[PDB]
From a paper:
We obtained high-resolution structures of JMJD5 comprising residues 182–416 (JMJD5∆1–181) in complex with catalytically inactive manganese (substituting for iron) and 2,4-PDCA (1.53 Å resolution), d-2HG (1.65 Å), l-2HG (1.36 Å) and the N-hydroxyimide 4 (1.49 Å). Analyses of the difference density (Fo-Fc) maps around the active site in the four structures reveal that all the crystallised inhibitors coordinate the metal ion in a bidentate manner and bind in the JMJD5 2OG pocket. As anticipated, in all the structures the catalytically inactive active site manganese (substituting for iron) is coordinated by the side chains of H321, D323, and H400. The metal coordination mode of the cyclic inhibitor N-hydroxyimide 4 is of particular interest. The metal ion is coordinated by the N-hydroxy group oxygen (trans to H321) and one of the imide carboxyl oxygens (trans to D323). The structure of JMJD5 complexed with 4 reveals that its ring is snugly bound in the 2OG pocket making hydrophobic interactions with the side chains of W310, L329, which normally interact with the 2OG methylenes. Our structure of 4 with JMJD5 implies stereoselective binding of a single enantiomer (the 3S-enantiomer) despite use of a racemic mixture for crystallisation. Comparison of the binding modes of 2,4-PDCA and 4 at the JMJD5 active site reveals that the binding modes of the rings of the two inhibitors overlap, implying that modification of them to optimised potency should be possible and suggesting that binding of bicyclic inhibitors such as IOX1/ ML-324 might reflect an approximate composite of the binding modes of 2,4-PDCA and 4. Furthermore, the functionalised 8-hydroxyisoquinoline inhibitor ML-324 (a JmjC KDM inhibitor)37 was markedly more potent than the simpler 5-carboxy-8-hydroxyquinoline (IOX1), a relatively broad spectrum 2OG oxygenase inhibitor that has been shown to induce iron movement at the active site of some JmjC KDMs 38.
Author numbering: 182 to 240, 248 to 416
Write the structure that this text describes.
């Protein structure tokens, strides 16, 4: 039930053993020496991005503030609520930061165009939680700062995850993974899963439609690549 870790697997090995069957894996030795891994201090983030406006999810509402405000209020000064700079195309907004990352070569195995890969930043304090849900594209999730606990359930287990009925929320589970209501959601308890702690320099492959749940264990910065 652990996600396997592979060092720089060949494109063919990744394609045949993980991409085509839709199996998660952690890629080591791929992003570990990207510039972001050494450069992205809080101070560097403030210097490069501090004055720019970013969307922040407050745990639930959505607001806007500068990066400096986000750091001051939700990171450094004993925050009062949880705030998460989540799912934001920060690298389109701030092209200088795009210099510190790369598109993984494995994305070339997809059917889509490189121009259509979506690169999102996920920057927040210890304790951010993304509830269990599934996405409609493949994902490489690159961990830069801090660690994340991640739980993964196959699409084959969707019945045991009790998706919301609304079309809007049908890709999201009704269950709180880490404190499930087994009186209401009894099938959840026996559903098999994989899990990991994703650390800096590692890349998690989340296959298209794989259900995933994520909790930050430390001050955390991740970069995701959504591709097909
Ligand atoms: O890290 C998180 O809190 C949530 C993750 C990051 C990511 O790329 N996707 O699709 C998520 O759901
Ligand atoms: Mn997701």
């Amino acid at each position: 039930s652990t996600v396997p870790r592979l060092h720089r697997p060949s494109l063919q090995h990744f394609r045949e053993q993980f991409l085509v069957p839709g199996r998660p894996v952690i890629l080591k030795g791929v992003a570990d020496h990207w510039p972001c891994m050494q450069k992205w201090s809080l101070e560097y983030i403030q210097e490069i991005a501090g004055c720019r406006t970013v969307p922040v999810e407050v745990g639930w509402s959505q607001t806007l503030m500068t990066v400096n405000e986000f750091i001051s209020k939700y990171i450094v000064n004993e925050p009062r609520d949880v705030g998460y700079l989540a799912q934001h195309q920060l690298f389109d907004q701030i092209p200088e930061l795009k210099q510190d990352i790369s598109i993984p070569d494995y994305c070339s195995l997809g059917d889509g165009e490189e121009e259509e890969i979506t690169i999102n930043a996920w920057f927040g304090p210890q304790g951010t939680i993304s509830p269990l849900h599934q996405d409609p594209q493949q994902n490489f999730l690159v961990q830069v700062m801090g660690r994340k606990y991640i739980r993964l359930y196959s699409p084959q287990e969707s019945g045991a995850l009790y998706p919301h009925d609304t079309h809007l929320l049908h890709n999201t589970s009704q269950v709180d993974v880490e404190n499930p209501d087994l009186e209401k959601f009894p099938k959840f308890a026996k559903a098999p899963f994989l899990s990991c702690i994703l650390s800096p320099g590692e890349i998690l492959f989340i296959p298209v439609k794989y259900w995933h749940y994520v909790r930050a264990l430390d001050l955390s910065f991740s970069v995701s690549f959504w591709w097909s």
